[PDB]
Amino acid sequence: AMLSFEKKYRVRGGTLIGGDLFDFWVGPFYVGIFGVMTVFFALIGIALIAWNTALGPTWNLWQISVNPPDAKYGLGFAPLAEGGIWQWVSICATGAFVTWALREVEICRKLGIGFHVPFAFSFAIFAYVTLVVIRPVLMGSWSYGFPYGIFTHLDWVSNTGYSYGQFHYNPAHMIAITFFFTTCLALALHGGLVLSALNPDRGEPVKSPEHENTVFRDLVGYSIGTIGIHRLGLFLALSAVFFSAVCMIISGPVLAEGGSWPDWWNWWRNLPIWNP
Amino acid sequence: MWRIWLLFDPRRALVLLFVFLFGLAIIIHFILLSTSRFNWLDGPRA
Amino acid sequence: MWRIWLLFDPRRALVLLFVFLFGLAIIIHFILLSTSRFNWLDGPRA
Amino acid sequence: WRIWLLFDPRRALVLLFVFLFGLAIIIHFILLSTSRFNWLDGPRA
Amino acid sequence: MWRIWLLFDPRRALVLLFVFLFGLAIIIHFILLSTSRFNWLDGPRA
Amino acid sequence: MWRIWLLFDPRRALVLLFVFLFGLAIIIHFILLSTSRFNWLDGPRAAK
Amino acid sequence: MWRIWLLFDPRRALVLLFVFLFGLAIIIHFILLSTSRFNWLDGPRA
Amino acid sequence: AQYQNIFTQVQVEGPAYAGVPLRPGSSPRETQTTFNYWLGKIGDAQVGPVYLGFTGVCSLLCGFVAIEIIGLNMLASVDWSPIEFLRQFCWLALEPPKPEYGLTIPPLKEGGWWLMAGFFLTVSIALWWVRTYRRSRALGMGTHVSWAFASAILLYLALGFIQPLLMGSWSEAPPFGVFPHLDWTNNFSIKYGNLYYNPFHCLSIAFLYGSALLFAMHGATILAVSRYGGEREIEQMLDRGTALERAALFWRWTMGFNATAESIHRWAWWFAVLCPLTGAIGIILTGPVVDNWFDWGVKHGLAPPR
Amino acid sequence: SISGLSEAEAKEFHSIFVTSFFLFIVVAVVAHILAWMWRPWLPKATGY
Amino acid sequence: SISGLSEAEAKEFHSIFVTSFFLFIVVAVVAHILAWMWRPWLPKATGY
Amino acid sequence: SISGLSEAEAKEFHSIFVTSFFLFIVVAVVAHILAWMWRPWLPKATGY
Amino acid sequence: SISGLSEAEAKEFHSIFVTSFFLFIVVAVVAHILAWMWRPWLPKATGY
Amino acid sequence: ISGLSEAEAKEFHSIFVTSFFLFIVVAVVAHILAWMWRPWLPKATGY
Amino acid sequence: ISGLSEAEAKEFHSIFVTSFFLFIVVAVVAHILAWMWRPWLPKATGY
Amino acid sequence: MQPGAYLDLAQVTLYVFWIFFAGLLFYLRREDKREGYPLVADAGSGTRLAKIGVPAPPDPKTYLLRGGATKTVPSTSNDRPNVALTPAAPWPGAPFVPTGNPFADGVGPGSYAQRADVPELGLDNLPIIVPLRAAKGMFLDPRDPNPVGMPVVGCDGVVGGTVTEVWVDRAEVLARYLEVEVAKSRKRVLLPVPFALINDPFGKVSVDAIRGDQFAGVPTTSKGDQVSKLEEDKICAYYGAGTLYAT
Numbered sequence A: 001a002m003l004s005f006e007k008k009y010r011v012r013g014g015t016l017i018g019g020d021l022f023d024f025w026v027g028p029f030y031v032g033i034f035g036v037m038t039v040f041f042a043l044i045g046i047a048l049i050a051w052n053t054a055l056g057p058t059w060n061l062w063q064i065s066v067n068p069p070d071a072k073y074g075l076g077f078a079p080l081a082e083g084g085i086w087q088w089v090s091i092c093a094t095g096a097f098v099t100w101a102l103r104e105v106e107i108c109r110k111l112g113i114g115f116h117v118p119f120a121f122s123f124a125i126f127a128y129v130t131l132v133v134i135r136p137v138l139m140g141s142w143s144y145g146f147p148y149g150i151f152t153h154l155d156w157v158s159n160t161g162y163s164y165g166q167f168h169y170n171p172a173h174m175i176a177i178t179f180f181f182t183t184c185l186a187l188a189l190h191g192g193l194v195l196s197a198l199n200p201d202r203g204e205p206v207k208s209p210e211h212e213n214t215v216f217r218d219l220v221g222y223s224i225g226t227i228g229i230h231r232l233g234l235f236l237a238l239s240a241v242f243f244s245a246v247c248m249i250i251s252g253p254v255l256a257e258g259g260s261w262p263d264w265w266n267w268w269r270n271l272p273i274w275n276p
Numbered sequence B, C, E, G: 001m002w003r004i005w006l007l008f009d010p011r012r013a014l015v016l017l018f019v020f021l022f023g024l025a026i027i028i029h030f031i032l033l034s035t036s037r038f039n040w041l042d043g044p045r046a
Numbered sequence D: 001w002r003i004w005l006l007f008d009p010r011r012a013l014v015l016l017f018v019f020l021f022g023l024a025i026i027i028h029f030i031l032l033s034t035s036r037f038n039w040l041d042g043p044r045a
Numbered sequence F: 001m002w003r004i005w006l007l008f009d010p011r012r013a014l015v016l017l018f019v020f021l022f023g024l025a026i027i028i029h030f031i032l033l034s035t036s037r038f039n040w041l042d043g044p045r046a047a048k
Numbered sequence H: 001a002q003y004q005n006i007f008t009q010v011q012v013e014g015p016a017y018a019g020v021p022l023r024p025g026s027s028p029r030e031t032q033t034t035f036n037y038w039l040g041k042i043g044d045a046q047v048g049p050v051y052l053g054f055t056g057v058c059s060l061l062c063g064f065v066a067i068e069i070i071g072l073n074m075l076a077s078v079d080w081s082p083i084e085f086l087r088q089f090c091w092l093a094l095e096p097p098k099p100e101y102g103l104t105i106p107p108l109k110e111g112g113w114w115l116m117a118g119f120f121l122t123v124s125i126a127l128w129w130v131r132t133y134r135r136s137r138a139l140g141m142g143t144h145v146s147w148a149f150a151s152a153i154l155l156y157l158a159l160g161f162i163q164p165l166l167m168g169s170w171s172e173a174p175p176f177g178v179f180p181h182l183d184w185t186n187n188f189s190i191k192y193g194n195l196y197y198n199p200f201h202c203l204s205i206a207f208l209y210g211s212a213l214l215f216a217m218h219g220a221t222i223l224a225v226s227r228y229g230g231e232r233e234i235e236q237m238l239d240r241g242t243a244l245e246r247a248a249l250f251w252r253w254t255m256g257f258n259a260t261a262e263s264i265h266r267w268a269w270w271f272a273v274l275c276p277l278t279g280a281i282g283i284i285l286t287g288p289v290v291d292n293w294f295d296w297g298v299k300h301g302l303a304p305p306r
Numbered sequence I, J, K, L: 001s002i003s004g005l006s007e008a009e010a011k012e013f014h015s016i017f018v019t020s021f022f023l024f025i026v027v028a029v030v031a032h033i034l035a036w037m038w039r040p041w042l043p044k045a046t047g048y
Numbered sequence M, N: 001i002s003g004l005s006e007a008e009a010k011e012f013h014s015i016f017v018t019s020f021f022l023f024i025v026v027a028v029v030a031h032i033l034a035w036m037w038r039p040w041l042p043k044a045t046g047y
Numbered sequence O: 001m002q003p004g005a006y007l008d009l010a011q012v013t014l015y016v017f018w019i020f021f022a023g024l025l026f027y028l029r030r031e032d033k034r035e036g037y038p039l040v041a042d043a044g045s046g047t048r049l050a051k052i053g054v055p056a057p058p059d060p061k062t063y064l065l066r067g068g069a070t071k072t073v074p075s076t077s078n079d080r081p082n083v084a085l086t087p088a089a090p091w092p093g094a095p096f097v098p099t100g101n102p103f104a105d106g107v108g109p110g111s112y113a114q115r116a117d118v119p120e121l122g123l124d125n126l127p128i129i130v131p132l133r134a135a136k137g138m139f140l141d142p143r144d145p146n147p148v149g150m151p152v153v154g155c156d157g158v159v160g161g162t163v164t165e166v167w168v169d170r171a172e173v174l175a176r177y178l179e180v181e182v183a184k185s186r187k188r189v190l191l192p193v194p195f196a197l198i199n200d201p202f203g204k205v206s207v208d209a210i211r212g213d214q215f216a217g218v219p220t221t222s223k224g225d226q227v228s229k230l231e232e233d234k235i236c237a238y239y240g241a242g243t244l245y246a247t
């Protein structure tokens, strides 16, 4: 159950709550108390989705959907059969995500490494909370959250997008898309570079970081380095999600639900340098 | 007021000053040319 | 009060001060020019 | 005489030339965009 | 006037001059081809 | 005029000249083929 | 005439020449195929 | 333990590095090289030198021919006024040809300039691909970077060349403009059903999301174990130290499985390459094969008849 | 003395800076007087 | 000292700088007088 | 001695610079006289 | 020199290159004669 | 300063000036021909 | 400074001029043929 | 595949992609198992057959090195399978407890790997991790703090020593280590830069991993101008142990 080098690391200690009661492994998985909690939350959420599906018309995987409450309930609690299942699944999902992050923190403490991974997961948790909690509250009702369906939340995305003219003109949306595409480009570059240094041409020895610096100084004239590329990767991947959360916060709560993003940019066309 | 030159390198102060002055002159000329009362090329409109 | 320069660098702070004041002035001027009462080139708008 | 003991003639000349060319292009385009001073197709409408 | 060549490398200066002249010529030809009066291919428009 | 070949390398200049000339030639051919009077393959476009 | 090969590397020249020739041939063939008169497959469009 | 590795504390400065000597068959590099203090706070401070030969110079020349065509058409569409050009620069474009010309060569003001700009941009991009391959080979390294670039090139060709061919019209291509090409994206999605129901579009989105996920994970992991010498990914594979052991054990105790110091970069390569590949397939299928993706989704049980 | 200056240099720069800032303020005050004379602001609750 | 200039250079540079600045200012003043004689600005609340 | 030039080289370069500058301005003045002879600018508030 | 080729190597390469080039030109000319026999190009200003 | 003597710069400048002058001559001839083909600079009313 | 001798410089120049002249001659012939196929430079009213 | 039939080209293409993606996932999980296999069985399990999982580990892989040597992975000699640990319980999945001193035994967060006992050689056969006094042409960019002279404090505020040198990485220019002279010993130890906050208190270097009085126990280098990979890994593990055992 342990890797050939793992035994010297499976020491006791480094927990947050629970002491040494939950300080064991089940196969490869560390447990802790947050592992028990997150598996519990996940299983309750899955059972609730299955129960909501049994009450529906189909078992088709692509058509399962847990719909948010109706707008007539405001920010209150809806009946279980008419919107409350969505609220409880949201609660369970949030709990599962928070407990997953805390279990990662415990693993980091036991291993003695930095806490960058749970910190980076907190950004995705923040985006989810912005989508299901913050924006629906600023708008007024839980009916603004997206459904839990493989192909119905895409319909939610498209309806929300067309509710603001053309969503492409959202400036934070543009910045987030730029960051996403740059993240993809940089991941491809880094993967290919390390692979080409470790698997060189036929009959060559394994290369060195000097070759890695040289190839990109020859291609584009600059190289960022081995720690710089990882810093930049984290930075880009987190900035994309930060700006997408900002993009969704200002749409609806700031710009009205019947407005248009193309017409915002007219602030540039009406500058007195060229307006009359 | 000659003291400032012991602190500021003229070979960059003058470049910054010239670029800024040119940008300002361009902006003011464009503003004037976009009006109708002060358009000195096509004249007033309507 | 002169000890601020024992705490900050004159050539690094004065440039930021100049940029700040210029941006503030250009913004105020554009805002005034965009109104109808305080427009001083084409005057009021009927 | 002016003291060129401060500015390298090479850079101060290449930048001056690029700047003058850009300014001249801008002025010619501004004039061409008008109807009164268009010297190729003439007045419009 | 020949003194200039003590300051400028004739190689870089001459290649920049060639690039500049070709670009200018291309731009002028394009502007002419874009009009109706001086279009020498397919002639005037209507 | 022969002295110029002490400034510029013949290889670089001669290899850039051919590239420049081919680019110019294909651009001119394309411009000619776009028009209706100088199209030599289909001829003049049918007048509407 | 052979002197050209004292300037050019024969391997590089052959690679460049073969790629250029194939590309030019495929371009001319495509242009011909796009027209109505010189289409040798299905012939003229009505 | 309290120092996060985001910014360099103290920077070391030495002489500039010329570079590994090139395999015979290449030109000499340049010699101009400088250092930047801000670039050294996050990464490396040396800037340059650069290598320019035949492929790079020809790539730049063709790309600038295309850029110049686009810009001169944008100036002509605004009556050569620089003021009105600057006023609305993101709203200008060089439109694709008109639908009434098929795949022929249209007049200049109706699609000829667009076609010439596309041709020269395509030649530029192909020359840059050749340059990446050549620069990688000149050092004895592999060619994984150029074969990752080929996938983006393939998506570009599908968007601009292949799908218009299979549709039989140049008008199916995007314009050269900032906002106009976003409008083209919107209208393309609207014209062929709903692009959300194209399964290869879904796969491409999944791979973009997974690319972001994996690159965040890898960056955070390498920064977390950098105190034990984890950023030297090549030496940690030929001689495994404790940094990569801790990195693997973190993810093994978290999610059950882990990678090595090399295989994670294969995961990276593949998740990055699979986005434009699936995207190109989905774009090639849209129009030539399927013309209404929502009807396809209804036929295969993706959505109710609605 | 962490900015890289001495006390005397600091006093010099501060004196010059104060006089320049003061001249700027005086010119601005005159400009505001003239601007108010041309067209006043701060209307009444009913408007101008 | 810090800009790399000695007192004499700084002082004479200041002198030429002030002279050129003054010529620029007087030319601008003449230009503004001419501009006002062509087309005055600063209208009244009812217009020109 | 900052630029890298001597003090006589500076005088020589400056003389040539001034002559070229003046020739340029003379040609520009003639160009503007001709341009005004073609189309006058600066209309009156009524128009041309 | 630049190419690092013996003059004998240069003449050998030149001979074989010219032979190949001439064969290519011959077959291309035959192809063009056959193509003109199939369909001529260069129409008149009115068409074919 | 650039890498030239005082005499080779002289002869380079001479050749440069002759080339420039002949280029200007050819351009002047082309402009005469172009004005004979299609004049520019119209009147305020048009051509 | 180009790594060239003087005799080989003059030889290169001679061959360059000869081939340049051949190119120019072929181009002029092609242009005569093109003009007798289709003239350009129309009149201000059209062809 | 005819028009009107249920089968069409898009879904055929999709299933082709699904099969390709299953194959690619298998290939990737196969590449993932080039280190740490076969597994070590837990307590109360059979040890006669090896555990490898369902994607079987691939054959060993050989890398060609610069000098002409080779390197075959997996690196089975880097595992250190016999350490001073005792199980805290007889059932499977139980944690282990150090029997002795975890700072000197190399267990837990203070665990190191058995790397090669030679320095990394760089592209000219000269060590890359080098003191600044032995790297001709490199300096410390005076815009940043100069750690040489600052005292070093532990996680408890006690001063452990002073900084005397900065060890840099050639071919990747960076400060990698600080040389610390202990308070009352005249002996030198190394401190990894990622473990130190230079200028956290205005004129000091703060290390919050070990107590100020533990710098005396940091492992030392054989030679004073170069460090091997094993020594680097040991020096890193020593500071890593304090994150859990400094108390």
Ligand code: BCL
Pocket (backbone or CB within 6 Å): G018, G019, G021, G022, G025, G026, G032, G038, G040, L024, L027, L028, L029, L031, L032, L035
């Ligand atoms: C009116 C139209 C006529 C016609 C009129 C003419 C005329 C006129 C000519 C030809 C000529 C040719 N015709 Mg024809 N031809 C027609 C129809 C065809 C068809 C077809 C299936 O319809 C084919 C295959 C051809 C093929 C050919 C070639 C034999 C020849 C082109 C020379 C060449 O390509 O240089 C290529 C030479 C090389 C050395 C290229 C080497 C390859 C390189 C090194 C590798 C490149 C790698 C590449 C980028 C990889 C990707 C490629 C893709 C996978 C495809 N013709 C029709 C019937 N044809 C020409 C000729 O005869 O010249 C001899 C010629 O003048």
Ligand code: BCL
Pocket (backbone or CB within 6 Å): A097, A124, A125, A127, A128, A131, A156, A157, A158, A159, A160, A161, A162, A167, A168, A173, A176, A177, A180, A241, A243, A244, A245, A247, A248, H185
């Ligand atoms: C017509 C519709 C509009 C449009 C309307 C919208 C709307 C509405 C939204 C977006 C959003 C996005 N749009 Mg948009 N958008 C359009 C066109 C585009 C185009 C394009 C090429 O045209 C692109 C590239 C994008 C890209 C983007 C991103 C900026 C953003 C999605 C990333 C994100 O939200 O991360 C966020 C990531 C998460 C939330 C992941 C959460 C992770 C959680 C915590 C983990 C879950 C684990 C799971 C439950 C368990 C799995 C375990 C299993 C065992 C595996 N849009 C069109 C024009 N777009 C979204 C956004 O910005 O929201 C912030 C959004 O809401």
Ligand code: BCL
Pocket (backbone or CB within 6 Å): A157, A181, A184, H067, H121, H125, H152, H153, H155, H156, H159, H176, H185, H186, H188, H189, H195, H196, H200, H201, H204, H205, H206, H208, H275, H276, H278, H279, H280, H282, H283
């Ligand atoms: C309303 C609009 C539609 C929509 C319409 C489209 C269309 C159309 C397309 C996509 C495509 C994609 N969409 Mg979408 N998309 C929508 C909603 C989304 C949402 C969302 C949350 O709603 C997201 C995250 C996405 C995201 C995605 C990606 C998965 C995919 C883009 C891959 C890529 O990286 O291309 C970026 C990379 C390239 C384009 C290749 C780069 C080419 C080369 C390498 C660059 C050369 C640059 C050159 C040198 C620069 C100089 C050039 C000159 C200056 C001109 N879409 C909605 C439903 N989407 C693309 C796709 O492939 O899907 C099938 C695509 O064609």
Ligand SMILES: CC[C@H]1c2cc3[nH]c4c(c3C)C(=O)[C@H](C(=O)OC)c4c3nc(cc4[nH]c(cc(n2)[C@@H]1C)c(C(C)=O)c4C)[C@@H](C)[C@@H]3CCC(=O)OC/C=C(\C)CCC[C@@H](C)CCC[C@@H](C)CCCC(C)C
Pocket (backbone or CB within 6 Å): A181, A182, A184, A185, A188, A189, A219, A220, A221, H050, H056, H059, H060, H061, H062, H063, H064, H124, H125, H128, H129, H132, H145, H146, H148, H149, H151, H152, H272, H273, H276
């Ligand atoms: C895995 C898919 C992702 C991807 C991958 C990818 N892109 C790549 C590569 C790879 C693997 C390269 O190797 C190549 C590269 O050089 O990267 C540094 C490149 C590249 N991807 C680029 C852009 C790009 N990639 C995009 C997308 C993506 N690329 C995908 C998301 C996009 C988007 C989202 O629209 C863009 C705009 C370029 C930066 C570069 C290819 C450059 C090129 O082809 O240049 C042609 C030349 C011109 C057009 C002439 C004009 C000059 C510039 C406008 C071009 C850029 C030049 C500059 C990068 C270098 C200049 C150096 C100088 C010293 C000469």
Ligand SMILES: COC1=C(OC)C(=O)C(C/C=C(/C)CC/C=C(\C)CC/C=C(\C)CC/C=C(\C)CC/C=C(\C)CC/C=C(\C)CC/C=C(/C)CC/C=C(\C)CC/C=C(\C)CCC=C(C)C)=C(C)C1=O
Pocket (backbone or CB within 6 Å): E019, E022, E023, E024, E026, E027, E030, F019, F020, F022, F023, F024, F026, F027, G012, G015, G016, G019, G020, G021, G022, G023, G024, G027, H053, H054, H055, H058, H061, H062, H064, H065, H066, H068, H069, H070, H072, H122, H123, H126, H127, H130
């Ligand atoms: C009126 O309009 C116009 C515009 O205004 C609208 C313009 O603004 C401009 C542009 C000019 C400017 C104003 C900008 C300034 C730019 C310059 C001064 C440069 C001038 C440029 C030209 C005059 C033309 C430029 C052309 C170039 C650089 C070469 C063009 C080459 C091709 C088009 C290739 C031919 C097509 C083929 C063969 C198709 C094959 C398919 C591919 C995509 C692959 C191509 C690959 C190769 C052929 C090379 C392969 C090489 C390899 C393998 C390497 C071998 C090893 C080596 C190292 C050699 C012009 C010209 C114009 O007119």
Ligand SMILES: COC1=C(OC)C(=O)C(C/C=C(\C)CC/C=C(\C)CC/C=C(\C)CC/C=C(\C)CC/C=C(\C)CC/C=C(\C)CC/C=C(/C)CC/C=C(\C)CC/C=C(\C)CCC=C(C)C)=C(C)C1=O
Pocket (backbone or CB within 6 Å): A076, A077, A086, A087, A088, A090, A091, A094, A132, A133, A142, A145
């Ligand atoms: C969409 O679906 C839906 C859910 O959503 C998934 C919902 O839920 C709910 C129900 C929710 C409500 C009725 C209230 C929702 C209101 C808001 C979200 C408004 C915004 C609120 C905030 C800004 C604060 C958010 C905090 C909340 C509400 C957490 C809930 C708290 C409890 C259940 C009590 C137990 C305490 C917990 C778990 C956290 C307490 C909250 C905090 C903010 C803690 C703050 C922590 C710190 C300040 C630092 C912590 C320091 C530590 C850990 C010390 C470490 C040790 C050291 C020594 C350093 C509905 C109806 C819903 O339909």
Ligand SMILES: CC(C)C/C=C/[C@@H](C)C/C=C/[C@@H](C)CCC[C@@H](C)CCCC[C@H](C)CCC[C@@H](C)CCC[C@@H](C)CCCC(C)(C)O
Pocket (backbone or CB within 6 Å): G027, G030, G031, H067, H068, H069, H070, H071, H072, H075, H115, H117, H118, H119, H122, H156, H157, H159, H160, H161, H173, H174, H175, H176, H177, H178, H181
């Ligand atoms: C007949 C055959 C043989 C030829 C065809 C050969 C084929 C192969 C061609 C296929 C072409 C396809 C493949 C390409 C399709 C393109 C799409 C995929 C993508 C569209 C690009 C989207 C961008 C956002 C464009 C913006 C560009 C613009 C904003 C820049 C303008 C620059 C100006 C300002 C220049 C500065 C101002 C001055 C005057 C100095 O210049």
Ligand SMILES: [Fe+3]
Pocket (backbone or CB within 6 Å): A190, A194, H218, H222, H233
């Ligand atoms: Fe990495």
